[PDB]
């Protein structure tokens, strides 16, 4: 973990020392989890808050942010948290995670290719750095601290008190936690269908290790554990070469060997695919495997040609007999392999969104190969595809009818929504407001959707700890977690949202059973705030904060 | 075969019409198989020879060359040969072709060799007669030009001995121009068919040149159908060795068409390897079905560049191991392939004939490579074309030496008794004897007589068909003297060079059969006479006795017995 230490990029905004003239000693205060504090300006806190009061269920993860700002050098700034105690009972401080909220270069408003102008760029607080044990802060700088309390499941309900000690070579901040009588199940038991596409090739490139070696998997374990502890349900698999035509910094390579032998037979080898899938299942991501893609963005299919001992490409489009023959041959081998492994029922062939013609022709092919193959799609609403798609994810702008949703729930199908570079808000860009990430989970509860999908968990740019920009899209679009298995503010807020989606579900189960129709109509009145057309009437921060309080009263 | 028709390149030497002023009508004559007749000059034949007398054994292939030269246009020149009669040799056994022209250059300016890179502009160029074109049925000759005709008589085995007579008819613009008379004395000895010859001929095959030239998929049905008559030329010359590339670019692409790997090298992401031999197997079976079945030579454990390609599953891409003989990494990489290869070859029944094949390198390298092979399987056969080393004489099952160096007679006999193969080669180093397109035809035959003189098992050359871009028109290349990279042509057309080499090989077989008969009969004199004749084929004696003279004298001596 010493090799995981790093330096931030230079701040493109210079520090005005006159703005710091009024700061006479180092300051410390509780801040808000809704705010990313600027590095180069004093915290906008005009008198310090020494106490923080939190409420949570047993089993819940709950966070707070403190801020330190200093007109002099602070050597070896450290945070530590006491045990929390309530009479003779204790939440042990092993369950409490601290991190420095570190800075990354971002830009602004979001689709299409970009030239970064470094004139348009700024440092923003986003990285939860729980690895570096101390930081030295330069004079005239501000530094956030993130505190995560993982409340154990067997914790006694009641009032817990504890201390956050900040040192540099001070103050104590007070932490109060009301633990309620209700229990939140562990992440492995959450209903919420979270899908954040994984990029293992980004990790092998960043650390310069052999793909799918022991070192590669050792590096991925804590990183993918971040996804599984957020309720991650879906394994991403690239079953061919460059499903997305190298749109990310690191292209996805094939996890399947496509070897066309010189006698006309094919040898398909799934060694990589199998290792990746088994690895992710051992971490608790086991609900679904999504296989990309039969319809890549460029319709050119790589295979290893033995006769010439080289890579070749079939150029073939859905609706062609050649496309049908090429995919039938692989999909029928793949079907047998999956059935041998016991993964067939959960494996989905996964599309991205194309002219209607294309998608139906691709579907014919899949069905000829095996009638029971499951299929998924993230794209636009089409009535034509509602009975064929076992997992259907729709743009936030479009809606399924309530009858469509129940028909799909009745049939055992998954129904979700996504955002990407199209939507200014809500989103998980590095300059997005933190509460927008939590908002996304509340929106799923409002819509009776099964969850939320985003296209990039960890498709890291070149220097993801320093600069979140990319040659396409708004900064942060390509990843939500960082090298070192470091979380972001964005993923932490999303996880709080998902925990509340589970609370709502548990509360409605209890209220329906007891005939408490009033409590149900109130939860639904509160859920009305999470409409994507109503964000100028009620800000995402305000909606999220009001809704949290309502659910916690029950 | 209509798609196999072609046009020659322009002659870079213009025609001197004063040199033709003496030629008043078309001339037709028997010529010599020792001469490549120049296109732009009259045949150097001071008066026409109408009769050709040949002698041969039953089973022997024997050739003659006629020449036509003309001061006027000859439209649709054609040759045809009658049955030969006494009993009959049917004319189905007789092949005719036009001796067509290819651009050639010359030795290195110093005249001492022909190796090293070259620009064509720094060297002469000239058209030379070399292609035996048996496919094109007629040619139109321009005024003031000369054209050779090659005639091959394949004497069937059951042919009755005695005097055979027949006619070669040459026609143009409809009419007959001349009949030439062909006489053939068939002797009461029998030469076995090529499949039964002892002579160890190794001419390295390049299947990738054929797939490129015809633009077909490698190791497809079309590719093999094209290669069948072409590789049959090699088998009918006594070819014994199948060339296999068991890794990517054994010679680092030194020829126009690089050799690809006939073996899939797949490093799986779980630490195991998968090797697949589907190409290798198809190529080997194909070549064995044509009668090339004695030996398979696998190139190479020691390429110049020392960079070994493999398919890396984890990254789904090609990678290269840089590892040198004498390194543990080289040893681990090759051991793993060679042990899998060993099992495969045993499953197929090919292990006893398969040789791992080196080219020449520092002594250190070769012995370290040998340790690796032996660790993999102690019974792996090994071969080498290079320099003489006493150190390697028990380890090399097939040892081919430069013509300049010698094994002792004891070394040869020890190697023969152990069942090993011992040969020599030439390449770009030797000005003569050689098979450059400008080399004298008899030099190709000479090579086989030299093997008989040295008690060697045969002869090796590095390129049967490593065709340049336009091999029918221009035999030059970016390296070496013209013709160094191939001996046969598109259309399964033979060269003068391969036809003469084949005659030499037939005589090597005759010598062997005659010595078997003379030892058994105690006729020690006839044996001492054959050896006195074989003394002419020394590579230091070519300024005392020209290769042509030596070959012609020797042929006569053997044919008297
Ligand atoms: C379901 C989804 O997110 N699809 C694409 C995604 O592949 C990526 O290109 C993204 C860039 O932000 O644009 C989205 O249209
Ligand atoms: C064994 C042998 O023939 N080796 C090389 C051959 O690879 C080729 O480069 C040739 C060119 O004429 O030169 C030979 O020395
Ligand atoms: Cl090569």
PDB file of C-alpha atoms in Angstrom, chain B residues 40-282:
ATOM      1  CA  UNK B  40      18.760 -11.866 -80.007  1.00  0.00           C
ATOM      2  CA  UNK B  41      21.635 -13.628 -81.873  1.00  0.00           C
ATOM      3  CA  UNK B  42      21.601 -16.456 -84.434  1.00  0.00           C
ATOM      4  CA  UNK B  43      22.264 -19.926 -83.070  1.00  0.00           C
ATOM      5  CA  UNK B  44      26.078 -20.555 -83.127  1.00  0.00           C
ATOM      6  CA  UNK B  45      25.466 -23.601 -85.382  1.00  0.00           C
ATOM      7  CA  UNK B  46      27.602 -23.364 -88.469  1.00  0.00           C
ATOM      8  CA  UNK B  47      25.597 -26.083 -90.334  1.00  0.00           C
ATOM      9  CA  UNK B  48      22.392 -27.876 -89.259  1.00  0.00           C
ATOM     10  CA  UNK B  49      22.322 -31.223 -87.472  1.00  0.00           C
ATOM     11  CA  UNK B  50      19.242 -33.220 -88.579  1.00  0.00           C
ATOM     12  CA  UNK B  51      19.848 -36.370 -86.486  1.00  0.00           C
ATOM     13  CA  UNK B  52      20.181 -36.775 -82.702  1.00  0.00           C
ATOM     14  CA  UNK B  53      21.440 -40.085 -81.242  1.00  0.00           C
ATOM     15  CA  UNK B  54      20.724 -40.809 -77.569  1.00  0.00           C
ATOM     16  CA  UNK B  55      21.472 -43.726 -75.270  1.00  0.00           C
ATOM     17  CA  UNK B  56      19.639 -44.562 -72.077  1.00  0.00           C
ATOM     18  CA  UNK B  57      18.560 -47.235 -69.682  1.00  0.00           C
ATOM     19  CA  UNK B  58      14.957 -48.386 -69.311  1.00  0.00           C
ATOM     20  CA  UNK B  59      13.259 -46.132 -66.727  1.00  0.00           C
ATOM     21  CA  UNK B  60      15.572 -43.234 -67.528  1.00  0.00           C
ATOM     22  CA  UNK B  61      14.493 -39.687 -68.393  1.00  0.00           C
ATOM     23  CA  UNK B  62      16.698 -38.262 -71.152  1.00  0.00           C
ATOM     24  CA  UNK B  63      16.488 -34.895 -72.854  1.00  0.00           C
ATOM     25  CA  UNK B  64      17.547 -33.143 -76.084  1.00  0.00           C
ATOM     26  CA  UNK B  65      17.338 -29.485 -77.180  1.00  0.00           C
ATOM     27  CA  UNK B  66      16.470 -28.253 -80.635  1.00  0.00           C
ATOM     28  CA  UNK B  67      16.809 -24.689 -81.846  1.00  0.00           C
ATOM     29  CA  UNK B  68      14.906 -22.576 -84.362  1.00  0.00           C
ATOM     30  CA  UNK B  69      16.249 -19.209 -85.495  1.00  0.00           C
ATOM     31  CA  UNK B  70      14.614 -16.931 -87.974  1.00  0.00           C
ATOM     32  CA  UNK B  71      15.190 -13.713 -89.979  1.00  0.00           C
ATOM     33  CA  UNK B  72      11.373 -13.360 -90.379  1.00  0.00           C
ATOM     34  CA  UNK B  73       8.191 -13.555 -88.298  1.00  0.00           C
ATOM     35  CA  UNK B  74       7.118 -17.111 -87.500  1.00  0.00           C
ATOM     36  CA  UNK B  75       3.458 -17.264 -86.500  1.00  0.00           C
ATOM     37  CA  UNK B  76       2.304 -20.091 -84.196  1.00  0.00           C
ATOM     38  CA  UNK B  77       5.504 -22.043 -83.945  1.00  0.00           C
ATOM     39  CA  UNK B  78       4.753 -25.579 -82.748  1.00  0.00           C
ATOM     40  CA  UNK B  79       6.757 -28.745 -81.954  1.00  0.00           C
ATOM     41  CA  UNK B  80       5.402 -32.270 -81.888  1.00  0.00           C
ATOM     42  CA  UNK B  81       7.027 -35.689 -81.410  1.00  0.00           C
ATOM     43  CA  UNK B  82       6.004 -39.028 -82.919  1.00  0.00           C
ATOM     44  CA  UNK B  83       5.891 -42.355 -81.120  1.00  0.00           C
ATOM     45  CA  UNK B  84       9.381 -43.866 -81.063  1.00  0.00           C
ATOM     46  CA  UNK B  85       9.352 -47.287 -82.701  1.00  0.00           C
ATOM     47  CA  UNK B  86      11.520 -50.367 -83.125  1.00  0.00           C
ATOM     48  CA  UNK B  87       7.675 -52.268 -80.056  1.00  0.00           C
ATOM     49  CA  UNK B  88       6.964 -48.586 -79.338  1.00  0.00           C
ATOM     50  CA  UNK B  89       7.699 -45.833 -76.785  1.00  0.00           C
ATOM     51  CA  UNK B  90       4.358 -44.050 -76.786  1.00  0.00           C
ATOM     52  CA  UNK B  91       4.531 -40.256 -77.302  1.00  0.00           C
ATOM     53  CA  UNK B  92       2.523 -39.807 -74.050  1.00  0.00           C
ATOM     54  CA  UNK B  93       5.881 -40.412 -72.396  1.00  0.00           C
ATOM     55  CA  UNK B  94       7.461 -37.462 -74.221  1.00  0.00           C
ATOM     56  CA  UNK B  95       7.250 -33.894 -73.028  1.00  0.00           C
ATOM     57  CA  UNK B  96       7.948 -30.862 -75.216  1.00  0.00           C
ATOM     58  CA  UNK B  97       8.450 -27.258 -74.134  1.00  0.00           C
ATOM     59  CA  UNK B  98       9.652 -23.879 -75.339  1.00  0.00           C
ATOM     60  CA  UNK B  99      12.834 -22.833 -73.545  1.00  0.00           C
ATOM     61  CA  UNK B 100      11.626 -19.358 -72.496  1.00  0.00           C
ATOM     62  CA  UNK B 101      13.585 -16.355 -71.275  1.00  0.00           C
ATOM     63  CA  UNK B 102      13.982 -14.705 -67.829  1.00  0.00           C
ATOM     64  CA  UNK B 103      15.897 -11.564 -66.716  1.00  0.00           C
ATOM     65  CA  UNK B 104      19.137 -12.455 -64.909  1.00  0.00           C
ATOM     66  CA  UNK B 105      22.195 -10.471 -63.734  1.00  0.00           C
ATOM     67  CA  UNK B 106      25.713 -11.838 -62.924  1.00  0.00           C
ATOM     68  CA  UNK B 107      28.203 -12.656 -60.152  1.00  0.00           C
ATOM     69  CA  UNK B 108      29.393  -9.921 -57.726  1.00  0.00           C
ATOM     70  CA  UNK B 109      31.641  -7.445 -59.600  1.00  0.00           C
ATOM     71  CA  UNK B 110      34.719  -9.075 -58.059  1.00  0.00           C
ATOM     72  CA  UNK B 111      33.628 -12.408 -59.659  1.00  0.00           C
ATOM     73  CA  UNK B 112      34.509 -14.210 -56.368  1.00  0.00           C
ATOM     74  CA  UNK B 113      30.985 -14.849 -55.184  1.00  0.00           C
ATOM     75  CA  UNK B 114      27.427 -13.720 -55.191  1.00  0.00           C
ATOM     76  CA  UNK B 115      26.305 -12.969 -51.576  1.00  0.00           C
ATOM     77  CA  UNK B 116      25.086  -9.684 -50.015  1.00  0.00           C
ATOM     78  CA  UNK B 117      22.270  -7.178 -50.718  1.00  0.00           C
ATOM     79  CA  UNK B 118      22.114  -5.529 -54.192  1.00  0.00           C
ATOM     80  CA  UNK B 119      20.387  -2.813 -56.318  1.00  0.00           C
ATOM     81  CA  UNK B 120      19.660  -4.063 -59.810  1.00  0.00           C
ATOM     82  CA  UNK B 121      20.898  -0.747 -61.405  1.00  0.00           C
ATOM     83  CA  UNK B 122      24.497  -1.495 -60.256  1.00  0.00           C
ATOM     84  CA  UNK B 123      24.532  -4.908 -62.048  1.00  0.00           C
ATOM     85  CA  UNK B 124      24.069  -6.002 -65.728  1.00  0.00           C
ATOM     86  CA  UNK B 125      20.843  -7.417 -66.894  1.00  0.00           C
ATOM     87  CA  UNK B 126      20.194  -9.809 -69.729  1.00  0.00           C
ATOM     88  CA  UNK B 127      17.569 -12.329 -70.879  1.00  0.00           C
ATOM     89  CA  UNK B 128      18.575 -15.953 -70.477  1.00  0.00           C
ATOM     90  CA  UNK B 129      16.912 -19.219 -71.604  1.00  0.00           C
ATOM     91  CA  UNK B 130      15.839 -21.191 -68.544  1.00  0.00           C
ATOM     92  CA  UNK B 131      12.070 -21.943 -68.336  1.00  0.00           C
ATOM     93  CA  UNK B 132      10.812 -25.267 -69.731  1.00  0.00           C
ATOM     94  CA  UNK B 133       7.389 -24.068 -70.838  1.00  0.00           C
ATOM     95  CA  UNK B 134       5.403 -27.222 -71.650  1.00  0.00           C
ATOM     96  CA  UNK B 135       2.047 -25.496 -71.210  1.00  0.00           C
ATOM     97  CA  UNK B 136       1.856 -22.811 -73.944  1.00  0.00           C
ATOM     98  CA  UNK B 137       1.027 -24.801 -77.144  1.00  0.00           C
ATOM     99  CA  UNK B 138       2.309 -22.225 -79.707  1.00  0.00           C
ATOM    100  CA  UNK B 139       4.580 -19.133 -79.797  1.00  0.00           C
ATOM    101  CA  UNK B 140       4.941 -16.328 -82.384  1.00  0.00           C
ATOM    102  CA  UNK B 141       8.611 -15.389 -82.844  1.00  0.00           C
ATOM    103  CA  UNK B 142       9.621 -11.926 -84.040  1.00  0.00           C
ATOM    104  CA  UNK B 143      12.064 -11.492 -86.957  1.00  0.00           C
ATOM    105  CA  UNK B 144      15.737 -11.989 -86.025  1.00  0.00           C
ATOM    106  CA  UNK B 145      15.194 -14.218 -82.994  1.00  0.00           C
ATOM    107  CA  UNK B 146      16.161 -17.618 -81.689  1.00  0.00           C
ATOM    108  CA  UNK B 147      14.005 -20.092 -79.718  1.00  0.00           C
ATOM    109  CA  UNK B 148      14.960 -23.335 -77.976  1.00  0.00           C
ATOM    110  CA  UNK B 149      12.744 -26.446 -77.727  1.00  0.00           C
ATOM    111  CA  UNK B 150      13.256 -28.963 -74.879  1.00  0.00           C
ATOM    112  CA  UNK B 151      12.325 -32.612 -75.440  1.00  0.00           C
ATOM    113  CA  UNK B 152      12.107 -35.055 -72.456  1.00  0.00           C
ATOM    114  CA  UNK B 153      11.694 -38.758 -73.153  1.00  0.00           C
ATOM    115  CA  UNK B 154      10.536 -40.740 -70.085  1.00  0.00           C
ATOM    116  CA  UNK B 155      11.454 -44.284 -71.025  1.00  0.00           C
ATOM    117  CA  UNK B 156       8.949 -46.673 -69.524  1.00  0.00           C
ATOM    118  CA  UNK B 157      10.303 -49.421 -67.337  1.00  0.00           C
ATOM    119  CA  UNK B 158       8.956 -52.380 -69.413  1.00  0.00           C
ATOM    120  CA  UNK B 159      10.402 -50.965 -72.673  1.00  0.00           C
ATOM    121  CA  UNK B 160      12.147 -53.605 -74.838  1.00  0.00           C
ATOM    122  CA  UNK B 161      15.872 -52.884 -75.332  1.00  0.00           C
ATOM    123  CA  UNK B 162      17.121 -51.856 -78.792  1.00  0.00           C
ATOM    124  CA  UNK B 163      17.067 -49.134 -81.418  1.00  0.00           C
ATOM    125  CA  UNK B 164      14.154 -46.723 -81.454  1.00  0.00           C
ATOM    126  CA  UNK B 165      13.461 -44.160 -84.081  1.00  0.00           C
ATOM    127  CA  UNK B 166      11.155 -41.167 -84.228  1.00  0.00           C
ATOM    128  CA  UNK B 167      10.493 -37.736 -85.642  1.00  0.00           C
ATOM    129  CA  UNK B 168      10.278 -34.199 -84.279  1.00  0.00           C
ATOM    130  CA  UNK B 169       8.090 -32.031 -86.548  1.00  0.00           C
ATOM    131  CA  UNK B 170       8.370 -28.232 -86.324  1.00  0.00           C
ATOM    132  CA  UNK B 171       5.588 -26.114 -87.868  1.00  0.00           C
ATOM    133  CA  UNK B 172       4.760 -22.373 -88.250  1.00  0.00           C
ATOM    134  CA  UNK B 173       2.170 -20.264 -90.271  1.00  0.00           C
ATOM    135  CA  UNK B 174       0.396 -23.593 -90.985  1.00  0.00           C
ATOM    136  CA  UNK B 175       3.171 -25.344 -92.943  1.00  0.00           C
ATOM    137  CA  UNK B 176       5.908 -27.856 -91.877  1.00  0.00           C
ATOM    138  CA  UNK B 177       9.453 -26.331 -91.686  1.00  0.00           C
ATOM    139  CA  UNK B 178      11.585 -29.311 -90.786  1.00  0.00           C
ATOM    140  CA  UNK B 179      11.482 -32.849 -89.501  1.00  0.00           C
ATOM    141  CA  UNK B 180      14.332 -33.680 -87.116  1.00  0.00           C
ATOM    142  CA  UNK B 181      15.247 -37.344 -86.544  1.00  0.00           C
ATOM    143  CA  UNK B 182      15.435 -38.759 -83.040  1.00  0.00           C
ATOM    144  CA  UNK B 183      17.288 -42.012 -82.476  1.00  0.00           C
ATOM    145  CA  UNK B 184      17.273 -43.691 -79.068  1.00  0.00           C
ATOM    146  CA  UNK B 185      19.309 -46.740 -78.102  1.00  0.00           C
ATOM    147  CA  UNK B 186      17.566 -48.337 -75.107  1.00  0.00           C
ATOM    148  CA  UNK B 187      20.038 -50.513 -73.165  1.00  0.00           C
ATOM    149  CA  UNK B 188      19.338 -53.769 -71.338  1.00  0.00           C
ATOM    150  CA  UNK B 189      19.625 -52.174 -67.869  1.00  0.00           C
ATOM    151  CA  UNK B 190      16.707 -50.801 -65.804  1.00  0.00           C
ATOM    152  CA  UNK B 191      16.720 -47.599 -63.678  1.00  0.00           C
ATOM    153  CA  UNK B 192      14.209 -47.742 -60.871  1.00  0.00           C
ATOM    154  CA  UNK B 193      11.486 -45.064 -60.642  1.00  0.00           C
ATOM    155  CA  UNK B 194      12.288 -41.844 -58.661  1.00  0.00           C
ATOM    156  CA  UNK B 195      10.514 -43.110 -55.502  1.00  0.00           C
ATOM    157  CA  UNK B 196      13.256 -45.818 -55.288  1.00  0.00           C
ATOM    158  CA  UNK B 197      16.403 -43.689 -55.781  1.00  0.00           C
ATOM    159  CA  UNK B 198      18.969 -43.643 -52.999  1.00  0.00           C
ATOM    160  CA  UNK B 199      20.060 -40.008 -53.756  1.00  0.00           C
ATOM    161  CA  UNK B 200      19.167 -37.678 -50.910  1.00  0.00           C
ATOM    162  CA  UNK B 201      17.840 -34.551 -52.600  1.00  0.00           C
ATOM    163  CA  UNK B 202      16.740 -31.720 -50.292  1.00  0.00           C
ATOM    164  CA  UNK B 203      15.367 -28.512 -51.967  1.00  0.00           C
ATOM    165  CA  UNK B 204      13.554 -26.426 -49.339  1.00  0.00           C
ATOM    166  CA  UNK B 205       9.901 -25.855 -50.231  1.00  0.00           C
ATOM    167  CA  UNK B 206       8.014 -22.580 -49.806  1.00  0.00           C
ATOM    168  CA  UNK B 207       4.253 -23.127 -49.784  1.00  0.00           C
ATOM    169  CA  UNK B 208       3.630 -19.483 -48.863  1.00  0.00           C
ATOM    170  CA  UNK B 209       5.133 -18.307 -52.198  1.00  0.00           C
ATOM    171  CA  UNK B 210       2.459 -20.258 -54.049  1.00  0.00           C
ATOM    172  CA  UNK B 211      -0.466 -18.966 -51.993  1.00  0.00           C
ATOM    173  CA  UNK B 212       0.811 -15.398 -52.500  1.00  0.00           C
ATOM    174  CA  UNK B 213       1.536 -15.707 -56.261  1.00  0.00           C
ATOM    175  CA  UNK B 214      -1.939 -17.179 -57.070  1.00  0.00           C
ATOM    176  CA  UNK B 215      -3.687 -15.095 -54.359  1.00  0.00           C
ATOM    177  CA  UNK B 216      -5.386 -18.055 -52.681  1.00  0.00           C
ATOM    178  CA  UNK B 217      -5.949 -18.948 -49.018  1.00  0.00           C
ATOM    179  CA  UNK B 218      -3.062 -20.933 -47.509  1.00  0.00           C
ATOM    180  CA  UNK B 219      -3.618 -24.676 -47.169  1.00  0.00           C
ATOM    181  CA  UNK B 220      -7.006 -24.435 -48.907  1.00  0.00           C
ATOM    182  CA  UNK B 221      -8.062 -26.994 -51.534  1.00  0.00           C
ATOM    183  CA  UNK B 222      -7.064 -24.511 -54.291  1.00  0.00           C
ATOM    184  CA  UNK B 223      -3.654 -24.025 -52.730  1.00  0.00           C
ATOM    185  CA  UNK B 224      -3.027 -27.780 -52.573  1.00  0.00           C
ATOM    186  CA  UNK B 225      -4.386 -28.362 -56.119  1.00  0.00           C
ATOM    187  CA  UNK B 226      -1.885 -25.752 -57.390  1.00  0.00           C
ATOM    188  CA  UNK B 227       0.958 -27.312 -55.419  1.00  0.00           C
ATOM    189  CA  UNK B 228       0.366 -30.895 -56.488  1.00  0.00           C
ATOM    190  CA  UNK B 229       2.054 -30.672 -59.952  1.00  0.00           C
ATOM    191  CA  UNK B 230       4.607 -28.191 -58.688  1.00  0.00           C
ATOM    192  CA  UNK B 231       5.844 -30.414 -55.801  1.00  0.00           C
ATOM    193  CA  UNK B 232       5.601 -33.450 -58.092  1.00  0.00           C
ATOM    194  CA  UNK B 233       8.591 -31.834 -59.968  1.00  0.00           C
ATOM    195  CA  UNK B 234      10.558 -32.190 -56.750  1.00  0.00           C
ATOM    196  CA  UNK B 235       9.382 -35.738 -55.996  1.00  0.00           C
ATOM    197  CA  UNK B 236      10.239 -36.888 -59.617  1.00  0.00           C
ATOM    198  CA  UNK B 237      13.745 -35.548 -59.121  1.00  0.00           C
ATOM    199  CA  UNK B 238      14.142 -37.815 -56.085  1.00  0.00           C
ATOM    200  CA  UNK B 239      13.134 -35.337 -53.388  1.00  0.00           C
ATOM    201  CA  UNK B 240      13.367 -36.859 -49.941  1.00  0.00           C
ATOM    202  CA  UNK B 241      12.819 -34.051 -47.431  1.00  0.00           C
ATOM    203  CA  UNK B 242       9.721 -32.121 -46.388  1.00  0.00           C
ATOM    204  CA  UNK B 243      10.394 -28.554 -45.202  1.00  0.00           C
ATOM    205  CA  UNK B 244       8.265 -27.482 -42.228  1.00  0.00           C
ATOM    206  CA  UNK B 245       8.173 -24.143 -40.490  1.00  0.00           C
ATOM    207  CA  UNK B 246       7.263 -24.949 -36.861  1.00  0.00           C
ATOM    208  CA  UNK B 247       7.468 -21.320 -35.773  1.00  0.00           C
ATOM    209  CA  UNK B 248       6.961 -17.851 -37.176  1.00  0.00           C
ATOM    210  CA  UNK B 249       9.572 -16.648 -39.688  1.00  0.00           C
ATOM    211  CA  UNK B 250      12.478 -19.122 -39.221  1.00  0.00           C
ATOM    212  CA  UNK B 251      14.571 -17.032 -41.590  1.00  0.00           C
ATOM    213  CA  UNK B 252      13.270 -13.599 -40.608  1.00  0.00           C
ATOM    214  CA  UNK B 253      11.574 -13.050 -43.993  1.00  0.00           C
ATOM    215  CA  UNK B 254      14.740 -13.222 -46.138  1.00  0.00           C
ATOM    216  CA  UNK B 255      12.732 -14.448 -49.126  1.00  0.00           C
ATOM    217  CA  UNK B 256       9.975 -12.413 -50.872  1.00  0.00           C
ATOM    218  CA  UNK B 257       7.364 -14.573 -49.053  1.00  0.00           C
ATOM    219  CA  UNK B 258       8.130 -15.179 -45.389  1.00  0.00           C
ATOM    220  CA  UNK B 259       7.405 -18.613 -43.872  1.00  0.00           C
ATOM    221  CA  UNK B 260       4.549 -18.536 -41.313  1.00  0.00           C
ATOM    222  CA  UNK B 261       4.205 -21.034 -38.464  1.00  0.00           C
ATOM    223  CA  UNK B 262       2.569 -24.348 -39.309  1.00  0.00           C
ATOM    224  CA  UNK B 263       2.022 -24.835 -35.501  1.00  0.00           C
ATOM    225  CA  UNK B 264      -0.282 -22.815 -33.242  1.00  0.00           C
ATOM    226  CA  UNK B 265       1.612 -21.656 -30.166  1.00  0.00           C
ATOM    227  CA  UNK B 266      -1.068 -20.770 -27.569  1.00  0.00           C
ATOM    228  CA  UNK B 267      -0.054 -19.716 -24.054  1.00  0.00           C
ATOM    229  CA  UNK B 268      -3.217 -20.003 -21.962  1.00  0.00           C
ATOM    230  CA  UNK B 269      -3.982 -17.689 -19.071  1.00  0.00           C
ATOM    231  CA  UNK B 270      -3.833 -20.543 -16.509  1.00  0.00           C
ATOM    232  CA  UNK B 271      -0.114 -21.213 -17.090  1.00  0.00           C
ATOM    233  CA  UNK B 272      -0.613 -24.124 -19.557  1.00  0.00           C
ATOM    234  CA  UNK B 273       0.039 -24.237 -23.291  1.00  0.00           C
ATOM    235  CA  UNK B 274      -1.987 -25.580 -26.192  1.00  0.00           C
ATOM    236  CA  UNK B 275      -0.234 -26.574 -29.422  1.00  0.00           C
ATOM    237  CA  UNK B 276      -2.148 -27.431 -32.570  1.00  0.00           C
ATOM    238  CA  UNK B 277      -0.529 -29.109 -35.610  1.00  0.00           C
ATOM    239  CA  UNK B 278      -3.429 -29.010 -38.137  1.00  0.00           C
ATOM    240  CA  UNK B 279      -1.464 -27.097 -40.812  1.00  0.00           C
ATOM    241  CA  UNK B 280       1.728 -29.053 -40.223  1.00  0.00           C
ATOM    242  CA  UNK B 281      -0.173 -32.365 -40.496  1.00  0.00           C
ATOM    243  CA  UNK B 282      -1.970 -31.384 -43.752  1.00  0.00           C
TER     244      UNK B 282
END
